[PDB]
Design a protein around this ligand. Structure first.
Ligand SMILES: NC(=O)c1ccc[n+]([C@@H]2O[C@H](COP(=O)([O-])OP(=O)(O)OC[C@H]3O[C@@H](n4cnc5c(N)ncnc54)[C@H](OP(=O)(O)O)[C@@H]3O)[C@@H](O)[C@H]2O)c1
Ligand SMILES: O=C(O)CCCCc1ccc(-c2cccc(O)c2)s1
Length: 316
């Protein structure tokens, strides 16, 4: 298992990164410092997570300490839905750069295909509770992303939570200048994504798997929900390999040629989650884990189901 995957912009992306959604701002600086100290070279960020300044403090310390060179880091962030207007994209990127204390991002993603009305609120509502869309076509948002490459602010651009028809719309865009490098999507044994992954990979787009542990700290968890970390069938595979269930859940996407971004703020777990380059799941293990698919989502963007660009009505 090589540590990096080649992107269609010619750069290499570490297959294991640290997630930062829900990482408290008072804990994420130490989490990122620990992660870099124990070998992580890829951090997954977003403006909407509200903790990029604190992530950036850690990155900057480790650069200043000469623990790692900037060239060796792969920093990802994402354009939030209220910044899809073409005239807002550059400023959104620059705010993220300023908070992360970087001069460039390695990868900048359209966070969701749904654009929202711009303003202070990340989920602007009408008086009846619906999210207020923006009329900016996503292909115009893509052109604005391409401009960031051509200004040196980002090395690569990509997409997140795009279904296969939306990926295809980008690939068919009149005058397309840069193909997406990555589509970052939810993926784990309960949402295995075979069709979307094969489509993206067949077009040279690398897939990043989010919520690989099933996001046990997601805010809307309910007792009746399935639980990957507690699934006896997955625990049994881990026991057979003398690894933890989380380690199996991280290794699984790696063997599908995916990038994977488990989140933790717990130092011992940050280190545990990186110790996944010393064992292999068998093809039978892989087929068995794939067989657990449920089409079950952590992130269904439930406030936006009427948005014209809502991604999860289509089969894939
Ligand atoms: N593009 C998108 O729309 C999108 C959406 C969702 C997520 N993401 C990205 O993907 C990342 C990962 O997804 P996620 O945060 O939803 O969930 P996740 O990585 O599946 O799970 C994180 C949870 O697992 C716990 N955990 C971590 N390592 C563990 C271990 N070894 N043993 C037991 N528990 C462990 C964490 O606890 P502690 O932190 O307390 O240790 C936290 O509660 C996000 O942080 C974000 O960067 C992107
Ligand atoms: O899209 C992504 O990458 C993950 C979600 C990011 C935006 C959010 C939606 C709902 C969130 C939330 C809901 C209730 C409580 C709480 O503390 C947070 S955060």
């Amino acid at each position: 298992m090589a540590s990096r995957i080649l992107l269609n912009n010619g750069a290499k992306m570490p297959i294991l990164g640290l997630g930062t959604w829900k990482s408290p701002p008072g804990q994420v600086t130490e989490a990122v410092k620990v992660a870099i100290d124990v070998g992580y070279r890829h951090i997954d960020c977003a403006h909407v997570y509200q903790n990029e300044n604190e992530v950036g403090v850690a990155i900057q310390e480790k650069l200043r300490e000469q623990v790692v060179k900037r060239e060796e880091l792969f920093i990802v962030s994402k354009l939030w839905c209220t910044y899809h207007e073409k005239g807002l994209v550059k400023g959104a990127c620059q705010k993220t750069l300023s908070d992360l204390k970087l001069d460039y991002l390695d990868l900048y993603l359209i966070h969701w295909p749904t654009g929202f009305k711009p303003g202070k609120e990340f989920f602007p509502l009408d008086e009846s509770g619906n999210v207020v869309p923006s009329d900016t076509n996503i292909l115009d948002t893509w052109a604005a992303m391409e401009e960031l490459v051509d200004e040196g602010l980002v090395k690569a651009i990509g997409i997140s939570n795009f279904n296969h028809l939306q990926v295809e719309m980008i690939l068919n865009k009149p005058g397309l200048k840069y193909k997406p490098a990555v589509n970052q999507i939810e993926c784990h044994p309960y949402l295995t994504q075979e069709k979307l992954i094969q489509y993206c990979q067949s077009k040279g787009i690398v897939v990043t798997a989010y919520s690989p542990l099933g996001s046990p700290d997601r805010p809307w968890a309910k007792p009746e929900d399935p639980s990957l970390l507690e699934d006896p069938r997955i625990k049994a595979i881990a026991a057979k390999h003398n690894k933890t269930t989380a380690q199996v859940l991280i290794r699984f996407p790696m063997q599908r040629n995916l990038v994977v971004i488990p989140k933790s703020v717990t130092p011992e777990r940050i280190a545990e989650n990186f110790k996944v380059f010393d064992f292999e799941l068998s093809s039978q293990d892989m087929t068995t884990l794939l067989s657990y698919n449920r089409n079950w989502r952590v992130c269904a963007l439930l406030s936006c189901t009427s948005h014209k660009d809502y991604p999860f009505h289509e089969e894939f």
